[PDB]
Curated annotation (Swiss-Prot), chains A, D:
Its cofactor is (R)-lipoate. Its EC number is 2.3.1.61. It catalyses: N(6)-[(R)-dihydrolipoyl]-L-lysyl-[protein] + succinyl-CoA = N(6)-[(R)-S(8)-succinyldihydrolipoyl]-L-lysyl-[protein] + CoA. GO terms for molecular function: acyltransferase activity; dihydrolipoyllysine-residue succinyltransferase activity. Its main location: mitochondrion. GO terms for cellular component: mitochondrial matrix; mitochondrion; nucleus; oxoglutarate dehydrogenase complex. This is Dihydrolipoyllysine-residue succinyltransferase component of 2-oxoglutarate dehydrogenase complex, mitochondrial. GO terms for biological process: 2-oxoglutarate metabolic process; L-lysine catabolic process to acetyl-CoA via saccharopine; succinyl-CoA metabolic process; tricarboxylic acid cycle. It comes from Bos taurus.
Length: 236, 227, 227, 236
């Protein structure tokens, strides 16, 4: 055999990132709750609205916008999940606005832009902002003010094939949604086993501020808004 | 509480207070390994005087995955602010004794076949059955494989053994319905969980490492192709 | 007849007048290798920028069989009345060029994967396509694999390359009816012929060596088990 | 990599064996002709006469005796194949007697006893002689006079799984029969494909003395005598 232990020194900013990551766990009391979403409806919608959508808006219709809009609706329903707890003053600051940070992928790494005031956006606007920030961040010119102060987060581990896992809360928030890969699985529809494209979804919430019942109902609200997008119009 | 059990508890809490631990799960189709061993077992037993379990397949697949991604094999040292890499690879595997469970180490697994891994596992399992297992046979593993399957668990989150950056936790094999070629079918499946130190290993890296282990265990011929 | 062709003919006759040559045949079911490559080809091409042929599988299987039985890897020297063994193993594989066929050598095949063997084969096939192939890349093979299959032959008797004790001759793959589990079935099969020097290698040894190659090629996972 | 060429010197008798082996090729003009034998009848016979045969003779009923007896019958039919050519005197010596050498397996190696005057033996006698010599040779006490002067040979490569090959004539003879492993193969019986246990058989003959037609007819005679053992009784 052989032995060798070459090494590299940790730079300043990576050390800062690690310290911040540990502070995130040492500040919040994190727990996770999982659920499954039937992705048939979104796939069926996009597989026929993609062509006309591409012609109209010069954009590709992914399913990220549906999740972003559903999460925005769920947050609007339950303000507490949109709030954050500040220990420096012993105050639970609420927020009337809602902006969401979505992770984008670059060969150099992954970064998290922010979508400002998502409550007034359609699917087209969300997709356009996502594409604009994904091409703007592909080149390194992404400034701090486009990454600062998200209230809620959506993490994408699905594109790499994970089944389900526990994400970690980005410091200045109270929750994070972690999506995962879509897999064909057998499910029971109307008392009969059937094959559908399903995906597990995991939510991590700060148990100090958000009760377990609140987190579970919030996740079920996201599920309801993603399975049948027409729920968004009914304000149901 | 005696001295050493108290020390164990303190070390266990230090493990969580040092690393930033997260977990990611996946499922592995165990048809191929079962089919291989159910017909190579007899000749393997005659040739090597050994029983062909599926532990060696997982150990070798994990070794291959680690060799593919060096960062997962590295550890982070806070005492000096350095990320020490390792060119060698040794793996600690948990063995069961009536008195308890202990974790020997397999040295330099990158140069071993299935037969060598099985022989080392059997030798250490019989050597540890008797209490004569020394410290130097338990010190300094770079990666770990934990066995909760033999007791019937479905899936769970293991805890990183202090001087490492990841741990693989296997679980019981259960027959479950899965979709093969658009049609529901019954196969023997098992959930696998990986716990990684999020300070050093990115989520994408952990997910790809777990998928690499899955690819190497589902179709062992991937090991030969270096794919 | 030019000088070198006359020398080649004289050497060829000396090959028969030195060794006591016999041949033994067998059949190999090529389903597994075809199924492996027909789905690992794309990812293998992306990873290594190479085409996954079945030559590497045969080379590796022959290397494993030779390692199992040292005597087949040995050669008999009449100039000193000594049977020289060899701890190393290098294999000569025939490559095709429009001007003719030549036989490079693969050095120390015992430490190679499929990827390394394929890379060496491609490198020597493109290096020999241009005439710049030197003597030291063709001298001193211990075992040989001859390719008559690409031209459509069914089976035949190859001739031992002088400084060796055996030669493996592959042949074309043809779909033939075979009995699997008591029922006639269609599979892609191929006849394989071995020529061995009967002075040094016993008939039983040659037959067992050929069966070992068959076992290693039908189910590549035998390579990992060291079975 | 590594290189090492340890070696062992060839002893006297192994060198003599090699010299004799090369002399065998340099004396005879060897050729080979193959054929296939349907082994259904012998298997069916022994699979039901084995028990009573074991009780009667305290012996195991293999198929070696059938081949030995069939070869003896074929040799008796064609005397020329039983003859040998002597270059030392330019004479083709015939033989009225017939003895056959059969190879036996020992952990130390393989050796070839001789069965004397096989023309007057049943299956039971041949099996008894084979067993007696196989147990006598298992212990090293096998003398020269039990190995000298066979007129015809039967070689066993089947037990090791070979399909077919070319054997080499034992010096003081004119032919050798090489059996091979029994494999289930599809064959055409009455115009319809069917599965039967078949085995390839190879004959090597000295082309100086034996014509190709004679060798082919001799092999077909062995096939006829082994497929339907009742041919032995009919003297057909």
């Amino acid at each position: 055999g052989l032995r060798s232990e070459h090494r590299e020194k940790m730079n300043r900013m990576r050390q800062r990132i690690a310290q911040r990551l540990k502070e995130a766990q040492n500040t919040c009391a994190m727990l996770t709750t999982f659920n499954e979403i039937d992705m048939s409806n979104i796939q069926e919608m996009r597989a026929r609205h993609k062509d006309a959508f591409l012609k109209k808006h010069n954009l590709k219709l992914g399913f990220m916008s549906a999740f972003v809009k559903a999460s925005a609706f769920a947050l609007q329903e339950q303000p507490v999940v949109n709030a954050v707890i500040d220990d420096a003053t012993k105050e639970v600051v609420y927020r009337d606005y809602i902006d969401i940070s979505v992770a984008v992928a670059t060969p150099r790494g992954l970064v998290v832009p922010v979508i400002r005031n998502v409550e007034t956006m359609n699917y087209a606007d969300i997709e356009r902002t996502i594409s604009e920030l994904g091409e703007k961040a592909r080149k390194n010119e992404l400034a701090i003010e486009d990454m600062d102060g998200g209230t809620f987060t959506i993490s994408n581990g699905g594109v790499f094939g994970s089944l389900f896992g526990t994400p970690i809360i980005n410091p200045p928030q109270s929750a994070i949604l972690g999506m995962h890969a879509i897999v064909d699985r057998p499910v029971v529809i109307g008392g009969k086993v059937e094959v559908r494209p399903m995906m597990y979804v995991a939510l991590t919430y700060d148990h100090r501020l958000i009760d377990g019942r609140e987190a579970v109902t919030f996740l079920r609200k996201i599920k309801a808004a993603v399975e049948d997008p027409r729920v968004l119009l009914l304000d149901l």
